[PDB]
């Protein structure tokens, strides 16, 4: 099954009352770590992280995050100066990796300014893709440090994947479980002469689910309306797909196929 590890950073200049800096880590859809400029402490966000990582992990990363917080503030200040921007602006970072089912891996590192792509790292050419002339100025300064580029490529391809495999083992009872979906089909005449069919699923984990409507055994040409995959609040998810009308709903979840004939 595909899994990922990602760390986010959010910096806000001149915030209301709201932390100046927040950093959160995730394994798949699960928060694992948190740090902000108010607590000034890195803490676990999953009990399987708290039980498997000794206090020295949290103590050391608290210090590193206090340094990264200070760097983020300065970087956001320089971006505002380059853009000639006043007031409150946001700066974001996302770093991470994925370990695919076939054992292959992906790695990514990206920055955003005011919630829009700003700089995207290409670990295969060791270069930063810039969206505008300010991002280009930063790209030139960052690409001048060859050692840092190589360090980032190593971290994405080796370190990130080793951390992800370690955290996957810690959280295996959560992350590697399967809760099959409970699926139902509801039929109703809506506007006169228009029948809608809803295929609804709930109680499933992992959130990844494939739902479609088929006619006489073939895919439709008519429009399918898709419901978002939503958290139900108990660690499981729900989703739906609907059509207007031999129809059958097809659901695939974690290597199991299901057909509901109407």
């Amino acid at each position: 099954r595909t899994h990922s590890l990602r760390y986010f950073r959010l910096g806000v200049s001149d915030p209301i009352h709201v932390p100046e800096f927040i950093s959160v880590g995730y394994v798949d859809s699960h928060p694992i770590t948190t740090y902000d400029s108010v607590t000034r402490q890195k803490e676990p966000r999953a009990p399987w992280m708290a039980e498997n990582l000794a206090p020295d992990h949290w103590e050391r990363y608290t210090q590193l995050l206090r340094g990264w917080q200070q760097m983020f503030k300065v970087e956001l200040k320089r971006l505002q100066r380059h853009y000639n921007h006043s007031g409150s602006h946001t700066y974001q970072r996302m770093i991470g990796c994925e370990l695919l089912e076939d054992g292959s891996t992906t790695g990514f590192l990206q920055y955003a300014y005011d919630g829009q792509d700003f700089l995207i790292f290409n670990k295969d050419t060791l270069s930063w893709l810039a969206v505008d002339n300010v991002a280009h100025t930063i790209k030139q300064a960052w690409e001048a440090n060859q050692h840092e580029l190589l360090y980032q490529k190593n971290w994405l391809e080796e370190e990130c994947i080793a951390w992800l495999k370690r955290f996957l083992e810690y959280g295996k009872d959560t992350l590697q479980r399967t809760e099959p979906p409970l699926v139902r089909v509801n039929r109703k005449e809506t506007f006169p002469g228009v029948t809608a069919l809803f295929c609804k699923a709930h109680g499933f984990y992992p959130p990844e689910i494939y739902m479609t409507w088929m006619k006489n055994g073939e895919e439709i040409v008519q429009e399918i309306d898709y419901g978002d995959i939503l958290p139900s609040g108990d660690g499981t998810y729900q989703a739906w797909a609907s059509i207007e009308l031999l129809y059958s709903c097809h659901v695939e979840h974690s290597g199991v196929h299901m057909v509901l004939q109407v």
Partner: antibody
Amino acid sequence: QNIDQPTEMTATEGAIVQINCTYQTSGFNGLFWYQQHAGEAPTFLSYNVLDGLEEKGRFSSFLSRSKGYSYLLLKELQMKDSASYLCAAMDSNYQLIWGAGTKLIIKP
Amino acid sequence: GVTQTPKFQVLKTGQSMTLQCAQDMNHNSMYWYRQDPGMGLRLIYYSASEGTTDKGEVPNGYNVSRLNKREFSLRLESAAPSQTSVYFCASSGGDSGELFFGEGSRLTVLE
């Protein structure tokens, strides 16, 4: 957890010397070499984090991440190369583990 | 780069001592190491940025002050002969950044 480099090496002026450094760490974020003349401060020589050899004048630094091995190679040795050479490996938490240093003696 | 003082100091057992260190390279991270024969450098205390400090590997008998972004002082509360050593201050830009070392401070603690 562990890093090893020879205590001392002796080579002849004009020749070549290879200083080996092996490390076993909990994760890896780079391998550094420093030069430290007697009674002076250490000064940065090289950094390797991907596999390969980097040349900087008469000095080259090699890394094999799969073998947890690095070497510092000094060519056309001069009496001024007599110094201690420190290798340091950065672990997964960006902490350095330092070798005890190699004292390099150059025979005129 | 990194300016540390004093170069040499003789102390009597139980005497107090402060080593000074300043860097003008705009580095967030600063470190205090001791160097002793036959072993690798040992971190005493470090400061990941202004406003924070933390223990290294051998913090006992020492304390530090990150006075501002430039300066990081090391204090020997009650000098002990085991503290006879060569002390190095250093700074780094962080991540893959190398260390920049101060000139070193040779301390000898005598009964």
